[PDB]
Design a protein around this ligand. Sequence first.
Ligand SMILES: [Mg+2]
Lengths: 80, 80, 178, 113
Amino acid sequence: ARSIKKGPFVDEHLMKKVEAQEGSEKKQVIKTWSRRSTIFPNFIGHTFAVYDGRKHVPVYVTEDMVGHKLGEFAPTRTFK
Amino acid sequence: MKQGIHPEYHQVIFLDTTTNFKFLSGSTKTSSEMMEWEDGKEYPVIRLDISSDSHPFYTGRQKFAAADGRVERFNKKFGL
Amino acid sequence: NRLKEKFNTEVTENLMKKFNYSSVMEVPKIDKIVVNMGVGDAVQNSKVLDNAVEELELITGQKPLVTKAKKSIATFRLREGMPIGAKVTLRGERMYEFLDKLISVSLPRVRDFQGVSKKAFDGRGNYTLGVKEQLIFPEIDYDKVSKVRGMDIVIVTTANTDEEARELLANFGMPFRK
Amino acid sequence: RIAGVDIPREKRVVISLTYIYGIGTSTAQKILEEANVSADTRVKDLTDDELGRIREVVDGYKVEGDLRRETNLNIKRLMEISSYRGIRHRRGLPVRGQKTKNNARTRKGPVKT
RNA sequence: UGGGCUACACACGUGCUACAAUGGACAAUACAAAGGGCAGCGAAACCGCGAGGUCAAGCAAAUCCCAUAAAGUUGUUCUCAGUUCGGAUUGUAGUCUGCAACUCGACUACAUGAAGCUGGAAUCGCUAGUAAUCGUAGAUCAGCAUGCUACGGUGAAUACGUUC
Ligand SMILES: [Mg+2]
Protein backbone atom coordinates (compact mmCIF):
# COMPACT_ATOMS: atom_id res chain seq x y z
CA ALA A 1 0.00 0.00 0.00
CA ARG A 2 1.41 3.40 -1.01
CA SER A 3 0.62 4.87 2.43
CA ILE A 4 3.53 3.94 4.73
CA LYS A 5 1.24 3.14 7.69
CA LYS A 6 -0.17 0.24 5.67
CA GLY A 7 2.53 -2.34 4.88
CA PRO A 8 3.63 -3.33 1.33
CA PHE A 9 0.75 -5.29 -0.19
CA VAL A 10 1.22 -9.00 -0.92
CA ASP A 11 -1.49 -11.56 -1.67
CA GLU A 12 -1.54 -14.12 1.15
CA HIS A 13 -1.43 -17.03 -1.31
CA LEU A 14 1.72 -15.63 -2.92
CA MET A 15 3.44 -14.94 0.41
CA LYS A 16 2.45 -18.31 1.90
CA LYS A 17 3.67 -20.12 -1.22
CA VAL A 18 7.08 -18.42 -0.94
CA GLU A 19 7.28 -19.04 2.82
CA ALA A 20 6.73 -22.80 2.35
CA GLN A 21 9.54 -22.79 -0.25
CA GLU A 22 11.99 -21.24 2.26
CA GLY A 23 13.05 -24.59 3.77
CA SER A 24 14.39 -26.27 0.62
CA GLU A 25 17.34 -24.91 -1.39
CA LYS A 26 16.04 -26.37 -4.67
CA LYS A 27 13.25 -23.84 -5.26
CA GLN A 28 10.46 -24.56 -7.77
CA VAL A 29 8.45 -22.16 -9.96
CA ILE A 30 5.49 -20.39 -8.31
CA LYS A 31 2.52 -19.79 -10.63
CA THR A 32 0.72 -16.54 -9.80
CA TRP A 33 -2.00 -14.31 -11.22
CA SER A 34 -0.93 -11.66 -8.69
CA ARG A 35 0.53 -8.83 -10.78
CA ARG A 36 -0.41 -6.52 -7.89
CA SER A 37 1.80 -8.20 -5.24
CA THR A 38 4.95 -6.44 -3.98
CA ILE A 39 8.32 -8.20 -4.24
CA PHE A 40 9.54 -8.73 -0.66
CA PRO A 41 13.20 -9.38 0.36
CA ASN A 42 12.10 -12.98 1.02
CA PHE A 43 11.22 -13.39 -2.68
CA ILE A 44 14.89 -13.14 -3.74
CA GLY A 45 16.06 -16.20 -5.69
CA HIS A 46 12.52 -17.30 -6.63
CA THR A 47 11.06 -17.62 -10.13
CA PHE A 48 7.43 -16.49 -10.36
CA ALA A 49 5.38 -17.43 -13.42
CA VAL A 50 3.26 -14.25 -13.53
CA TYR A 51 0.25 -14.23 -15.90
CA ASP A 52 0.46 -11.67 -18.73
CA GLY A 53 -3.27 -12.07 -19.45
CA ARG A 54 -2.66 -14.90 -21.94
CA LYS A 55 0.40 -16.78 -20.61
CA HIS A 56 2.40 -17.09 -17.39
CA VAL A 57 5.82 -15.53 -18.06
CA PRO A 58 8.87 -16.66 -15.99
CA VAL A 59 10.07 -13.89 -13.65
CA TYR A 60 13.20 -14.49 -11.54
CA VAL A 61 13.59 -12.13 -8.56
CA THR A 62 16.92 -10.34 -8.04
CA GLU A 63 17.94 -7.95 -5.25
CA ASP A 64 17.12 -4.84 -7.32
CA MET A 65 13.59 -6.14 -8.05
CA VAL A 66 12.58 -5.83 -4.36
CA GLY A 67 10.02 -3.06 -3.77
CA HIS A 68 8.61 -3.36 -7.31
CA LYS A 69 5.43 -5.28 -8.17
CA LEU A 70 5.57 -8.69 -9.90
CA GLY A 71 3.43 -7.19 -12.69
CA GLU A 72 6.18 -4.67 -13.51
CA PHE A 73 8.44 -7.45 -14.83
CA ALA A 74 5.90 -9.20 -17.10
CA PRO A 75 4.55 -7.19 -20.11
CA THR A 76 0.84 -7.13 -21.03
CA ARG A 77 1.17 -5.47 -24.47
CA THR A 78 3.33 -6.28 -27.52
CA PHE A 79 4.68 -3.69 -29.99
CA LYS A 80 6.99 -4.31 -32.98
CA MET B 1 63.98 33.31 -22.36
CA LYS B 2 63.57 36.00 -25.05
CA GLN B 3 63.01 39.54 -23.74
CA GLY B 4 59.58 41.12 -24.21
CA ILE B 5 57.91 38.04 -25.75
CA HIS B 6 56.70 36.45 -22.48
CA PRO B 7 53.88 37.64 -20.15
CA GLU B 8 54.93 39.08 -16.78
CA TYR B 9 55.31 36.17 -14.33
CA HIS B 10 55.79 36.62 -10.58
CA GLN B 11 55.83 34.47 -7.43
CA VAL B 12 52.37 34.57 -5.80
CA ILE B 13 50.96 32.96 -2.64
CA PHE B 14 48.09 30.54 -3.32
CA LEU B 15 45.87 30.29 -0.23
CA ASP B 16 43.13 27.72 0.38
CA THR B 17 40.56 29.77 2.31
CA THR B 18 38.72 26.63 3.48
CA THR B 19 41.75 24.93 5.09
CA ASN B 20 44.04 27.99 5.40
CA PHE B 21 46.78 26.30 3.32
CA LYS B 22 49.41 28.67 1.89
CA PHE B 23 51.93 27.77 -0.84
CA LEU B 24 54.16 29.94 -3.05
CA SER B 25 54.28 29.24 -6.80
CA GLY B 26 54.84 31.26 -9.98
CA SER B 27 51.85 32.70 -11.86
CA THR B 28 50.99 35.57 -14.22
CA LYS B 29 48.08 36.47 -11.90
CA THR B 30 48.32 39.86 -10.16
CA SER B 31 46.58 40.26 -6.79
CA SER B 32 45.91 43.58 -5.04
CA GLU B 33 45.91 41.65 -1.75
CA MET B 34 49.46 40.77 -0.66
CA MET B 35 50.56 38.51 2.21
CA GLU B 36 53.82 37.91 4.09
CA TRP B 37 55.69 34.60 3.75
CA GLU B 38 58.05 32.49 5.89
CA ASP B 39 60.91 34.08 3.93
CA GLY B 40 61.30 37.83 4.47
CA LYS B 41 59.22 38.85 1.43
CA GLU B 42 55.61 39.79 0.66
CA TYR B 43 53.78 38.30 -2.34
CA PRO B 44 50.28 38.82 -3.87
CA VAL B 45 47.75 36.31 -2.52
CA ILE B 46 45.44 34.19 -4.71
CA ARG B 47 42.47 32.74 -2.80
CA LEU B 48 41.32 29.21 -3.70
CA ASP B 49 37.88 27.82 -2.83
CA ILE B 50 39.26 24.27 -3.02
CA SER B 51 42.73 22.69 -3.19
CA SER B 52 44.48 19.31 -2.82
CA ASP B 53 44.09 19.65 0.96
CA SER B 54 40.38 20.56 0.79
CA HIS B 55 39.21 18.50 -2.21
CA PRO B 56 37.22 15.37 -1.16
CA PHE B 57 38.89 12.97 -3.62
CA TYR B 58 42.37 13.90 -2.36
CA THR B 59 41.29 13.67 1.30
CA GLY B 60 39.24 10.52 0.66
CA ARG B 61 36.46 11.96 2.84
CA GLN B 62 32.99 10.65 1.99
CA LYS B 63 30.64 13.65 1.98
CA PHE B 64 27.58 11.44 1.36
CA ALA B 65 26.88 7.85 2.45
CA ALA B 66 26.47 5.11 -0.18
CA ALA B 67 22.96 4.44 -1.51
CA ASP B 68 21.07 1.76 0.44
CA GLY B 69 20.36 -1.60 -1.21
CA ARG B 70 16.81 -2.40 -2.37
CA VAL B 71 16.41 -4.98 0.42
CA GLU B 72 17.75 -2.48 2.97
CA ARG B 73 15.48 0.39 1.92
CA PHE B 74 12.39 -1.85 1.93
CA ASN B 75 13.05 -3.09 5.48
CA LYS B 76 14.00 0.38 6.79
CA LYS B 77 11.04 2.12 5.13
CA PHE B 78 8.31 -0.16 6.51
CA GLY B 79 10.28 -1.00 9.68
CA LEU B 80 10.37 -4.71 8.78
CA ASN C 1 61.17 24.98 -5.41
CA ARG C 2 58.73 23.10 -3.15
CA LEU C 3 58.02 20.38 -5.73
CA LYS C 4 61.71 20.30 -6.70
CA GLU C 5 62.78 20.13 -3.04
CA LYS C 6 60.47 17.15 -2.47
CA PHE C 7 61.85 15.47 -5.60
CA ASN C 8 65.47 16.14 -4.62
CA THR C 9 65.02 14.73 -1.10
CA GLU C 10 61.82 12.78 -0.43
CA VAL C 11 61.01 11.47 -3.93
CA THR C 12 64.60 10.44 -4.74
CA GLU C 13 64.83 8.46 -1.49
CA ASN C 14 61.53 6.67 -2.14
CA LEU C 15 62.35 5.74 -5.76
CA MET C 16 65.92 4.53 -5.11
CA LYS C 17 64.71 2.35 -2.22
CA LYS C 18 61.77 1.04 -4.28
CA PHE C 19 63.72 0.07 -7.42
CA ASN C 20 67.14 -0.58 -5.81
CA TYR C 21 68.90 1.89 -8.12
CA SER C 22 72.69 1.53 -7.96
CA SER C 23 73.27 5.22 -8.77
CA VAL C 24 71.39 8.47 -8.06
CA MET C 25 71.55 9.17 -11.81
CA GLU C 26 69.36 6.08 -12.37
CA VAL C 27 66.53 7.72 -10.39
CA PRO C 28 63.77 8.90 -12.82
CA LYS C 29 63.01 12.59 -13.41
CA ILE C 30 60.52 14.64 -15.46
CA ASP C 31 62.40 15.95 -18.51
CA LYS C 32 59.71 18.32 -19.81
CA ILE C 33 56.02 19.27 -19.87
CA VAL C 34 54.40 20.15 -23.21
CA VAL C 35 50.90 21.68 -23.33
CA ASN C 36 49.22 21.19 -26.73
CA MET C 37 45.95 22.77 -27.86
CA GLY C 38 44.51 21.61 -31.19
CA VAL C 39 42.36 24.29 -32.84
CA GLY C 40 40.80 22.98 -36.06
CA ASP C 41 38.23 25.75 -35.51
CA ALA C 42 41.07 28.14 -36.41
CA VAL C 43 40.60 27.02 -40.03
CA GLN C 44 37.05 28.42 -39.87
CA ASN C 45 38.04 31.48 -37.79
CA SER C 46 41.57 32.80 -37.18
CA LYS C 47 40.43 34.53 -33.98
CA VAL C 48 39.73 31.17 -32.29
CA LEU C 49 43.45 30.30 -32.48
CA ASP C 50 44.38 33.78 -31.22
CA ASN C 51 42.12 33.38 -28.17
CA ALA C 52 43.65 29.96 -27.45
CA VAL C 53 47.20 31.38 -27.70
CA GLU C 54 46.35 34.03 -25.09
CA GLU C 55 44.89 31.41 -22.73
CA LEU C 56 47.95 29.14 -23.07
CA GLU C 57 50.23 32.16 -22.59
CA LEU C 58 48.41 32.96 -19.33
CA ILE C 59 48.36 29.34 -18.14
CA THR C 60 52.05 28.60 -18.80
CA GLY C 61 53.41 32.16 -18.48
CA GLN C 62 55.33 31.78 -21.77
CA LYS C 63 54.34 32.60 -25.36
CA PRO C 64 53.09 29.48 -27.23
CA LEU C 65 54.52 28.21 -30.51
CA VAL C 66 51.80 28.13 -33.18
CA THR C 67 51.66 24.72 -34.91
CA LYS C 68 51.06 24.54 -38.66
CA ALA C 69 49.45 21.62 -40.50
CA LYS C 70 51.95 19.06 -41.82
CA LYS C 71 49.59 18.00 -44.63
CA SER C 72 46.29 19.01 -46.24
CA ILE C 73 43.13 17.00 -45.44
CA ALA C 74 39.92 17.75 -47.36
CA THR C 75 37.54 16.40 -44.70
CA PHE C 76 38.98 18.79 -42.10
CA ARG C 77 39.18 21.45 -44.83
CA LEU C 78 42.85 21.58 -43.85
CA ARG C 79 45.59 23.10 -46.03
CA GLU C 80 49.29 22.44 -45.38
CA GLY C 81 51.04 25.25 -43.49
CA MET C 82 47.80 26.60 -41.96
CA PRO C 83 47.99 27.44 -38.21
CA ILE C 84 45.73 24.95 -36.41
CA GLY C 85 47.30 24.70 -32.93
CA ALA C 86 49.62 26.09 -30.25
CA LYS C 87 52.20 24.38 -28.02
CA VAL C 88 54.32 25.40 -25.01
CA THR C 89 57.32 23.50 -23.61
CA LEU C 90 57.89 24.05 -19.88
CA ARG C 91 61.35 23.25 -18.46
CA GLY C 92 63.28 23.88 -15.23
CA GLU C 93 61.65 26.05 -12.55
CA ARG C 94 58.68 26.90 -14.79
CA MET C 95 57.89 23.19 -15.19
CA TYR C 96 57.87 22.44 -11.44
CA GLU C 97 55.76 25.54 -10.67
CA PHE C 98 53.18 24.56 -13.31
CA LEU C 99 53.08 20.92 -12.15
CA ASP C 100 52.67 21.85 -8.47
CA LYS C 101 49.85 24.26 -9.40
CA LEU C 102 48.17 21.60 -11.56
CA ILE C 103 48.04 19.04 -8.72
CA SER C 104 47.45 21.65 -5.99
CA VAL C 105 44.91 23.99 -7.64
CA SER C 106 43.96 23.26 -11.27
CA LEU C 107 43.18 19.53 -10.86
CA PRO C 108 40.99 20.20 -7.75
CA ARG C 109 39.09 22.85 -9.74
CA VAL C 110 38.24 20.18 -12.36
CA ARG C 111 34.47 19.60 -12.34
CA ASP C 112 33.33 16.23 -10.97
CA PHE C 113 36.98 15.30 -10.36
CA GLN C 114 37.36 11.57 -9.70
CA GLY C 115 41.17 11.44 -10.05
CA VAL C 116 43.36 11.15 -13.16
CA SER C 117 43.51 7.98 -15.29
CA LYS C 118 46.23 5.49 -14.28
CA LYS C 119 46.26 3.95 -17.78
CA ALA C 120 47.39 7.15 -19.53
CA PHE C 121 50.98 5.99 -20.08
CA ASP C 122 52.63 5.39 -23.48
CA GLY C 123 54.42 2.27 -22.20
CA ARG C 124 57.74 4.15 -22.19
CA GLY C 125 57.21 5.92 -18.86
CA ASN C 126 55.60 8.99 -20.46
CA TYR C 127 52.23 10.30 -19.24
CA THR C 128 49.66 12.40 -21.11
CA LEU C 129 46.80 14.21 -19.34
CA GLY C 130 43.78 15.68 -21.14
CA VAL C 131 41.90 18.63 -19.62
CA LYS C 132 38.25 19.14 -20.64
CA GLU C 133 38.32 22.93 -20.11
CA GLN C 134 40.95 25.64 -19.51
CA LEU C 135 38.61 27.18 -16.91
CA ILE C 136 40.11 24.70 -14.42
CA PHE C 137 43.41 26.63 -14.45
CA PRO C 138 43.39 29.47 -11.85
CA GLU C 139 44.70 32.28 -14.08
CA ILE C 140 41.90 31.82 -16.65
CA ASP C 141 38.76 33.88 -15.93
CA TYR C 142 35.30 32.73 -17.05
CA ASP C 143 34.25 36.20 -18.24
CA LYS C 144 37.43 36.60 -20.32
CA VAL C 145 37.07 33.22 -22.07
CA SER C 146 34.53 33.29 -24.92
CA LYS C 147 34.76 29.54 -25.59
CA VAL C 148 35.72 26.77 -23.13
CA ARG C 149 38.46 24.60 -24.69
CA GLY C 150 40.41 21.50 -23.64
CA MET C 151 44.20 20.99 -23.62
CA ASP C 152 46.66 18.08 -23.75
CA ILE C 153 49.37 18.04 -21.06
CA VAL C 154 52.23 15.65 -21.87
CA ILE C 155 54.60 14.86 -18.98
CA VAL C 156 57.85 13.35 -20.30
CA THR C 157 59.80 11.34 -17.71
CA THR C 158 63.29 9.80 -17.96
CA ALA C 159 61.74 6.68 -16.37
CA ASN C 160 62.02 3.71 -18.74
CA THR C 161 58.77 2.06 -17.59
CA ASP C 162 55.29 3.35 -16.69
CA GLU C 163 55.47 1.80 -13.22
CA GLU C 164 58.55 3.89 -12.36
CA ALA C 165 56.78 6.91 -13.88
CA ARG C 166 53.63 6.20 -11.84
CA GLU C 167 55.71 6.16 -8.64
CA LEU C 168 57.33 9.50 -9.53
CA LEU C 169 53.94 11.15 -10.16
CA ALA C 170 52.43 9.57 -7.01
CA ASN C 171 55.37 10.90 -4.97
CA PHE C 172 54.66 14.35 -6.46
CA GLY C 173 51.13 13.83 -5.12
CA MET C 174 49.38 13.56 -8.50
CA PRO C 175 45.86 12.14 -7.84
CA PHE C 176 45.13 8.82 -9.56
CA ARG C 177 41.75 7.25 -10.35
CA LYS C 178 42.87 3.81 -9.10
CA ARG D 1 32.19 30.06 -7.55
CA ILE D 2 30.15 27.60 -5.46
CA ALA D 3 30.12 23.78 -5.76
CA GLY D 4 32.34 23.90 -8.86
CA VAL D 5 29.94 26.29 -10.63
CA ASP D 6 30.63 29.93 -11.48
CA ILE D 7 27.23 31.37 -10.53
CA PRO D 8 26.02 34.65 -12.18
CA ARG D 9 27.63 37.60 -10.38
CA GLU D 10 25.06 40.27 -11.30
CA LYS D 11 21.96 38.51 -9.92
CA ARG D 12 20.84 38.33 -6.27
CA VAL D 13 22.32 35.31 -4.47
CA VAL D 14 18.88 33.76 -3.88
CA ILE D 15 18.54 33.41 -7.67
CA SER D 16 22.25 32.81 -8.43
CA LEU D 17 22.39 29.69 -6.23
CA THR D 18 19.69 28.06 -8.39
CA TYR D 19 22.18 27.92 -11.29
CA ILE D 20 23.71 24.95 -9.42
CA TYR D 21 22.43 21.42 -10.16
CA GLY D 22 20.62 20.06 -7.09
CA ILE D 23 19.72 23.58 -5.87
CA GLY D 24 16.34 25.17 -6.61
CA THR D 25 14.44 28.12 -5.15
CA SER D 26 13.40 26.24 -1.99
CA THR D 27 16.87 24.83 -1.26
CA ALA D 28 18.58 28.16 -2.06
CA GLN D 29 16.37 29.96 0.47
CA LYS D 30 17.25 27.36 3.12
CA ILE D 31 21.01 27.49 2.48
CA LEU D 32 21.08 31.30 2.73
CA GLU D 33 19.07 31.14 5.97
CA GLU D 34 21.50 28.62 7.51
CA ALA D 35 24.51 30.67 6.35
CA ASN D 36 22.68 33.81 7.55
CA VAL D 37 23.51 35.47 4.21
CA SER D 38 20.94 37.90 2.78
CA ALA D 39 18.96 36.91 -0.32
CA ASP D 40 19.04 40.48 -1.67
CA THR D 41 22.84 40.89 -1.80
CA ARG D 42 24.16 40.40 -5.34
CA VAL D 43 27.01 37.91 -5.83
CA LYS D 44 29.23 40.75 -7.08
CA ASP D 45 28.58 42.49 -3.73
CA LEU D 46 29.02 39.26 -1.71
CA THR D 47 31.85 39.14 0.85
CA ASP D 48 34.57 36.47 1.18
CA ASP D 49 33.43 35.49 4.69
CA GLU D 50 29.84 35.27 3.40
CA LEU D 51 30.97 33.20 0.40
CA GLY D 52 32.72 30.70 2.69
CA ARG D 53 29.61 30.53 4.88
CA ILE D 54 27.49 29.70 1.80
CA ARG D 55 30.08 27.15 0.64
CA GLU D 56 29.86 25.27 3.95
CA VAL D 57 26.08 24.89 3.60
CA VAL D 58 26.12 23.91 -0.10
CA ASP D 59 28.66 21.18 0.78
CA GLY D 60 25.83 19.77 2.92
CA TYR D 61 23.62 19.16 -0.15
CA LYS D 62 24.36 16.61 -2.89
CA VAL D 63 24.82 18.68 -6.06
CA GLU D 64 26.20 18.77 -9.62
CA GLY D 65 28.15 15.59 -10.46
CA ASP D 66 27.11 13.84 -7.24
CA LEU D 67 23.38 14.20 -7.93
CA ARG D 68 23.71 13.63 -11.70
CA ARG D 69 25.51 10.32 -11.05
CA GLU D 70 22.84 9.17 -8.56
CA THR D 71 19.93 9.93 -10.90
CA ASN D 72 21.58 8.10 -13.81
CA LEU D 73 22.18 4.98 -11.69
CA ASN D 74 18.52 4.79 -10.63
CA ILE D 75 17.44 4.94 -14.29
CA LYS D 76 20.18 2.45 -15.25
CA ARG D 77 18.95 0.13 -12.47
CA LEU D 78 15.40 0.27 -13.86
CA MET D 79 16.67 -0.52 -17.37
CA GLU D 80 18.84 -3.42 -16.15
CA ILE D 81 16.10 -5.06 -14.04
CA SER D 82 13.78 -4.91 -17.10
CA SER D 83 11.13 -2.87 -15.26
CA TYR D 84 8.20 -1.50 -17.27
CA ARG D 85 9.51 2.00 -16.49
CA GLY D 86 13.05 0.90 -17.39
CA ILE D 87 11.93 -0.54 -20.74
CA ARG D 88 10.14 2.73 -21.57
CA HIS D 89 13.35 4.60 -20.69
CA ARG D 90 15.08 2.38 -23.27
CA ARG D 91 12.33 2.95 -25.86
CA GLY D 92 12.09 6.71 -25.24
CA LEU D 93 8.34 6.56 -24.57
CA PRO D 94 6.39 8.15 -21.65
CA VAL D 95 7.48 6.42 -18.44
CA ARG D 96 4.76 7.71 -16.08
CA GLY D 97 1.67 6.28 -17.82
CA GLN D 98 0.79 9.17 -20.18
CA LYS D 99 -1.07 8.31 -23.41
CA THR D 100 0.98 7.95 -26.62
CA LYS D 101 -1.71 7.92 -29.34
CA ASN D 102 -1.19 11.70 -29.38
CA ASN D 103 1.45 14.03 -27.89
CA ALA D 104 4.40 12.44 -26.00
CA ARG D 105 6.63 14.77 -28.03
CA THR D 106 9.03 15.75 -25.23
CA ARG D 107 9.91 12.05 -24.85
CA LYS D 108 9.55 11.07 -28.53
CA GLY D 109 11.35 14.14 -29.93
CA PRO D 110 10.19 16.04 -33.08
CA VAL D 111 7.47 14.73 -35.44
CA LYS D 112 8.48 12.14 -38.07
CA THR D 113 5.44 12.24 -40.40
C1' U E 1 -8.98 -14.41 -12.03
C1' G E 2 -5.81 -11.61 -15.16
C1' G E 3 -5.26 -8.52 -19.40
C1' G E 4 -7.49 -4.96 -22.88
C1' C E 5 -10.82 -0.64 -23.78
C1' U E 6 -4.96 3.66 -21.36
C1' A E 7 -1.30 0.36 -27.55
C1' C E 8 2.06 4.57 -30.95
C1' A E 9 6.36 5.67 -37.03
C1' C E 10 1.81 9.19 -37.77
C1' A E 11 -3.06 12.46 -39.81
C1' C E 12 -7.32 15.27 -38.05
C1' G E 13 -11.26 17.63 -34.55
C1' U E 14 -12.15 19.97 -29.64
C1' G E 15 -9.71 21.90 -25.45
C1' C E 16 -5.92 23.21 -21.52
C1' U E 17 -1.28 26.09 -20.46
C1' A E 18 2.30 29.46 -22.31
C1' C E 19 5.57 32.33 -25.07
C1' A E 20 6.25 37.86 -19.68
C1' A E 21 6.89 43.75 -17.51
C1' U E 22 -0.97 45.52 -19.20
C1' G E 23 4.32 40.50 -16.36
C1' G E 24 6.65 37.03 -12.33
C1' A E 25 7.56 36.55 -7.10
C1' C E 26 6.54 38.19 -2.13
C1' A E 27 3.58 40.88 1.55
C1' A E 28 -0.63 43.42 3.29
C1' U E 29 -5.80 44.41 2.36
C1' A E 30 -11.64 44.31 -0.08
C1' C E 31 -16.12 43.04 -2.82
C1' A E 32 -20.33 37.73 -5.11
C1' A E 33 -23.67 34.60 -6.91
C1' A E 34 -25.60 29.97 -7.48
C1' G E 35 -25.41 25.22 -5.32
C1' G E 36 -24.43 20.57 -2.07
C1' G E 37 -24.68 17.70 2.82
C1' C E 38 -26.61 11.66 7.12
C1' A E 39 -24.15 8.88 7.94
C1' G E 40 -23.05 13.05 4.94
C1' C E 41 -20.75 18.30 5.37
C1' G E 42 -17.25 18.53 9.11
C1' A E 43 -15.59 23.79 12.42
C1' A E 44 -12.14 25.00 16.11
C1' A E 45 -7.65 23.10 18.24
C1' C E 46 -3.06 20.27 17.92
C1' C E 47 0.72 17.96 14.60
C1' G E 48 3.16 17.93 9.42
C1' C E 49 7.02 22.12 4.71
C1' G E 50 2.76 20.46 2.40
C1' A E 51 -0.57 17.07 0.33
C1' G E 52 -2.86 15.24 5.01
C1' G E 53 -3.38 13.12 10.05
C1' U E 54 -5.60 13.24 15.20
C1' C E 55 -9.49 14.66 18.27
C1' A E 56 -14.01 16.53 17.71
C1' A E 57 -18.29 21.17 17.92
C1' G E 58 -22.31 22.20 15.19
C1' C E 59 -25.52 20.81 11.59
C1' A E 60 -31.25 16.61 7.89
C1' A E 61 -30.31 23.51 6.60
C1' A E 62 -32.13 31.49 5.57
C1' U E 63 -29.18 28.39 11.86
C1' C E 64 -23.91 24.33 11.11
C1' C E 65 -20.40 22.82 7.43
C1' C E 66 -18.41 22.76 2.36
C1' A E 67 -16.09 27.98 2.00
C1' U E 68 -11.14 32.82 2.95
C1' A E 69 -13.90 33.82 -4.17
C1' A E 70 -10.44 35.30 -7.73
C1' A E 71 -9.36 39.00 -10.86
C1' G E 72 -8.98 43.45 -7.78
C1' U E 73 -6.38 47.54 -4.40
C1' U E 74 -1.78 49.25 -1.93
C1' G E 75 3.48 48.27 -1.28
C1' U E 76 8.42 45.66 -2.01
C1' U E 77 11.52 43.33 -5.57
C1' C E 78 12.98 41.62 -10.21
C1' U E 79 14.51 44.53 -15.33
C1' C E 80 13.80 42.48 -21.16
C1' A E 81 16.11 36.90 -21.41
C1' G E 82 14.69 31.42 -23.15
C1' U E 83 15.08 34.98 -18.06
C1' U E 84 13.19 35.37 -10.94
C1' C E 85 9.11 33.91 -18.34
C1' G E 86 7.07 28.99 -19.21
C1' G E 87 6.47 24.23 -16.58
C1' A E 88 6.65 19.63 -20.19
C1' U E 89 9.71 15.58 -18.66
C1' U E 90 12.33 12.55 -15.29
C1' G E 91 14.49 11.05 -10.32
C1' U E 92 13.36 10.52 -5.36
C1' A E 93 10.61 10.87 -0.94
C1' G E 94 5.34 11.04 0.61
C1' U E 95 -0.41 11.62 1.29
C1' C E 96 -5.28 9.85 0.32
C1' U E 97 -9.14 6.56 -1.66
C1' G E 98 -9.69 1.60 -2.37
C1' C E 99 -9.63 -5.30 -1.69
C1' A E 100 -5.68 -3.79 -4.71
C1' A E 101 -3.01 2.46 -7.80
C1' C E 102 2.40 -2.85 -12.18
C1' U E 103 -0.06 -2.40 -16.61
C1' C E 104 -3.42 2.27 -15.17
C1' G E 105 -5.62 7.24 -10.02
C1' A E 106 -5.57 12.00 -7.82
C1' C E 107 -2.63 15.16 -4.90
C1' U E 108 2.06 16.91 -2.20
C1' A E 109 7.49 18.00 -1.21
C1' C E 110 12.42 18.41 -3.10
C1' A E 111 15.27 18.32 -7.33
C1' U E 112 15.10 18.41 -12.57
C1' G E 113 13.91 22.55 -16.00
C1' A E 114 11.51 20.55 -22.88
C1' A E 115 9.23 23.07 -26.67
C1' G E 116 7.75 27.85 -26.74
C1' C E 117 10.14 34.69 -28.72
C1' U E 118 2.68 35.13 -30.41
C1' G E 119 2.30 31.20 -34.99
C1' G E 120 2.20 29.30 -43.36
C1' A E 121 -1.69 28.35 -46.35
C1' A E 122 -6.24 28.65 -43.90
C1' U E 123 -10.05 29.20 -40.30
C1' C E 124 -13.71 30.28 -35.72
C1' G E 125 -16.92 32.91 -31.99
C1' C E 126 -19.27 37.21 -30.54
C1' U E 127 -23.76 43.26 -31.34
C1' A E 128 -23.81 44.43 -24.20
C1' G E 129 -23.86 43.06 -19.11
C1' U E 130 -22.30 40.28 -24.81
C1' A E 131 -17.08 39.16 -26.19
C1' A E 132 -12.75 38.89 -23.30
C1' U E 133 -10.97 37.78 -18.56
C1' C E 134 -11.24 36.01 -13.25
C1' G E 135 -12.57 32.78 -9.99
C1' U E 136 -17.29 29.71 -7.71
C1' A E 137 -20.70 25.48 -7.55
C1' G E 138 -23.17 20.93 -9.07
C1' A E 139 -24.23 16.03 -11.46
C1' U E 140 -21.56 11.37 -12.07
C1' C E 141 -18.54 9.74 -8.03
C1' A E 142 -14.50 5.04 -3.04
C1' G E 143 -10.95 7.78 -5.53
C1' C E 144 -10.53 10.18 -10.32
C1' A E 145 -12.42 16.42 -14.90
C1' U E 146 -8.05 20.92 -18.99
C1' G E 147 -15.00 17.86 -20.14
C1' C E 148 -20.21 19.08 -19.16
C1' U E 149 -24.01 22.00 -16.77
C1' A E 150 -24.86 26.20 -13.87
C1' C E 151 -22.89 31.09 -11.02
C1' G E 152 -21.49 35.76 -10.15
C1' G E 153 -17.08 39.73 -10.43
C1' U E 154 -14.49 43.03 -13.82
C1' G E 155 -16.12 44.47 -18.40
C1' A E 156 -14.91 46.49 -23.56
C1' A E 157 -14.46 47.74 -29.43
C1' U E 158 -17.51 48.45 -33.38
C1' A E 159 -22.03 48.31 -36.71
C1' C E 160 -21.07 53.67 -42.57
C1' G E 161 -23.95 50.21 -44.81
C1' U E 162 -26.00 46.04 -47.98
C1' U E 163 -22.03 45.91 -53.72
C1' C E 164 -19.93 41.44 -52.21
MG1 LIG F 1 -12.29 4.92 -24.94
